[PDB]
Design a protein around this ligand. Structure first.
Ligand SMILES: NC(=O)C1=CN([C@@H]2O[C@H](COP(=O)(O)OP(=O)(O)OC[C@H]3O[C@@H](n4cnc5c(N)ncnc54)[C@H](O)[C@@H]3O)[C@@H](O)[C@H]2O)C=CC1
Ligand SMILES: NC(=O)C1=CN([C@@H]2O[C@H](COP(=O)(O)OP(=O)(O)OC[C@H]3O[C@@H](n4cnc5c(N)ncnc54)[C@H](O)[C@@H]3O)[C@@H](O)[C@H]2O)C=CC1
Ligand SMILES: [Zn+2]
Ligand SMILES: [Zn+2]
Ligand SMILES: [Zn+2]
Ligand SMILES: [Zn+2]
Lengths: 374, 374
């Protein structure tokens, strides 16, 4: 009988860029029509949430960040049909309305109801469910998972297996699905191909998992932090290279290593220069390069379109190209059936109250995924 | 007999950039091992040849330009197995060695023996078969068709049907195949899709022919020269737009016209700005944009990689992605079988001696293809 009532609970509020989060009481309004209020159980720390703190991923502040999570439905608003109270759910930072031209397209996943392209930091109705110190607080990507309770639109939540371990499957809400799908769905990596993966964090490791699942013969991990190489090899990298070790640009190194360029490359960092390097290192006639990393806000890259004229394909994707609400429950079912592993991404576990310590671990280079438990 | 002897003949020599072609006597050496000497019958004037004159497509000078042609084999060197004297042939500006990693790849066509990436202006053996006034003259793309006779490597020639009309099928050597293949093979335009085509010259009109052949429902032609619109509609454009008629950037106009972005766009001009505009006007989640136009040498474009992160695909191709020696004879057979039309591309037919007048028709906006006859 919190149904229909304001919930007071602890959240991690970001009042200002480049500051620690503030763990303090917020008010969470009850769900309106076609909204769902969720008791959070676990949430991952994704680099994207750090990019909000840095101001390189722009969204209105003050904000409740967090987008990679799982929890249990506390209550549903009028007209909700796809979840019920007590269901295990993953919030969907890329919604799936099922009605727009993108949701109807066989390839498209970047649903037109998204709050990513022109971020408002609201619910679909352009309002906020969060108050803190009597002030309205923004949502983030329609999820806001750094809170003991959040409210999401129905098109931004999926029901998952009632027996799911939420402290693992939260990663299906961002890192795992994004990297894995970038390899298997967006690039469509082929058997016996040579792949290069720039960035060996939680998302790059999931790209290597996808490239190994698709049968790549060679998977070259690229990182300036050599501490990341051991885990990259554990999940399928065949060799790792640190650009800092070489006199020549790493695109020339990777072209040499692959006897004329790789089949597939992935940028999984968020830098303009590595997006161009990753395109250049794929074979000039038939290579494919996928951008996964989030670039610094409003900045343009410079490149020579002759890289494309010879035959390269350049593409990007959100959330591994997966239609979110269709895909997430299937990915959970596949995890439950041991079709892929999440433990290699989880390097640290902390209670929610130690969220700043978890951000310090990511910023130091020491962690892949820290899972926060409520 | 001419076999085994130097031929003295008329060619159009380009001694330096931004000068008219010089019609004069050249000496054409006999073919060496694995070379083919061709009597030219017809050659088209392609914008790429004008870009050599402008200095925006860099190749060593002085040069015999011309790459879109057909002729008859005069003689063969030792070891030639794929053509014989008397055969009708089309020179291949993109070769097909059949042995390199690209030629062996199911998608690749940019054969590693090409003279496009790092142009030397020679035969495969690094020498020239042309002299003029006692000076060696460079080849262009392994073809050099602005000459009564040329010598090509065997991997740069295809045998075609003995009954084909060379004054039309010369366009299968460049413009038609480039535009048609960019639509049907590189973009893989789908039935009922909406396409935008930037540039309505000979290659852009061939892109429209391919989009119509693939069953596109809407084909929007874009040109600053409204005199190009009537012929674009004859070969399948459903509507034409001139960016100069609008207050808003044309990417915004096309996104509005297509109710949120086109399925397929094509840049068929050669400008950095229209390459970015064409990418932007394709739907952000599932759009495909193909670069066909040749950009100005050594210039980089500037773009926001968020255009790709949402889901766009950006790709370019040489020669419509066709593997050149396999494809050109089949395209000629398909033309003989009335599967497509070439007459709509031909606006002017001039004697070879009128090459400069042909180029002035292209520069003035008055022609699509001028065919020069020997
Ligand atoms: N497209 C999408 O849907 C999603 C994109 N993102 C983005 O993916 C990127 C990766 O996220 P995570 O794996 O969580 O981050 P992470 O920070 O854990 O991993 C990035 C890795 O890149 C390495 N790196 C940094 N600079 C480098 C350089 N110059 N050259 C080579 N390696 C370098 C770092 O050492 C680190 O190991 C971030 O930009 C993030 O915002 C994350 C998930 C969703
Ligand atoms: N990728 C490949 O294998 C090939 C590429 N090319 C390139 O394709 C391009 C087109 O070649 P052609 O059709 O022979 O050229 P063309 O000059 O006949 O056609 C170009 C059209 O673009 C239009 N145009 C110029 N500026 C424009 C602007 N700012 N906005 C909109 N329209 C504009 C012109 O009015 C003209 O109708 C050239 O860059 C050529 O070098 C041609 C053939 C093979
Ligand atoms: Zn939708
Ligand atoms: Zn994320
Ligand atoms: Zn080859
Ligand atoms: Zn051409």
């Amino acid at each position: 009988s919190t149904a229909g009532k304001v919930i007071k609970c602890k959240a991690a509020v970001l009042w200002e860029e480049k500051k620690p989060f503030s763990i303090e009481e917020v008010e969470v309004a009850p769900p309106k029509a076609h909204e769902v209020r969720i008791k959070m159980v676990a949430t991952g720390i994704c680099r994207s949430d750090d990019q909000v703190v840095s101001g390189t991923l722009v969204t209105p502040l003050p904000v409740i960040a967090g987008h990679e999570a799982a929890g249990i439905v506390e209550s549903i608003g009028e007209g909700v049909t796809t979840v019920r109270p007590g269901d295990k759910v993953i919030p969907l930072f890329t919604p799936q309305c099922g009605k727009c031209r993108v949701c109807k397209h066989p390839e498209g996943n970047f649903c037109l109801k998204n709050d990513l392209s022109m971020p408002r930091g609201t619910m679909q109705d352009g309002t906020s469910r969060f108050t803190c110190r009597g002030k309205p607080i923004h949502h983030f990507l329609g999820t806001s998972t750094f809170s003991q309770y959040t409210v999401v639109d129905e098109i931004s939540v999926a029901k998952i297996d009632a027996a799911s371990p939420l402290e693992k499957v939260c990663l299906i809400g961002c890192g795992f699905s994004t990297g894995y799908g970038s390899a298997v769905k967006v690039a469509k990596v082929t058997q016996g191909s040579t792949c290069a993966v720039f960035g060996l964090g939680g998302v790059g490791l999931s790209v290597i998992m996808g490239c190994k699942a698709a049968g790549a013969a060679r998977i070259i991990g690229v990182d300036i932090n050599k501490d990341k190489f051991a885990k990259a090899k554990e999940v399928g990298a065949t060799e790792c290279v640190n650009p800092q070790d070489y006199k020549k640009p790493i695109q020339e190194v990777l072209t040499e290593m692959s006897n004329g360029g790789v089949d597939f490359s992935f940028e999984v960092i968020g830098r303009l220069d590595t997006m161009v390097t990753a395109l250049s290192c794929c074979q000039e006639a038939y290579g494919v390069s996928v951008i996964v990393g989030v670039p610094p806000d409003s900045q343009n890259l410079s490149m020579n379109p002759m890289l494309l004229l010879s035959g390269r394909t350049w593409k990007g994707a959100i959330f591994g190209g997966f239609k979110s609400k269709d895909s997430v429950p299937k990915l959970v079912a596949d995890f439950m059936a041991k079709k892929f592993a999440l433990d290699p991404l989880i390097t640290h576990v902390l209670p929610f109250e130690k969220i700043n310590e978890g951000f310090d671990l990511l910023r130091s280079g020491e962690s892949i995924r820290t899972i926060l438990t409520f």
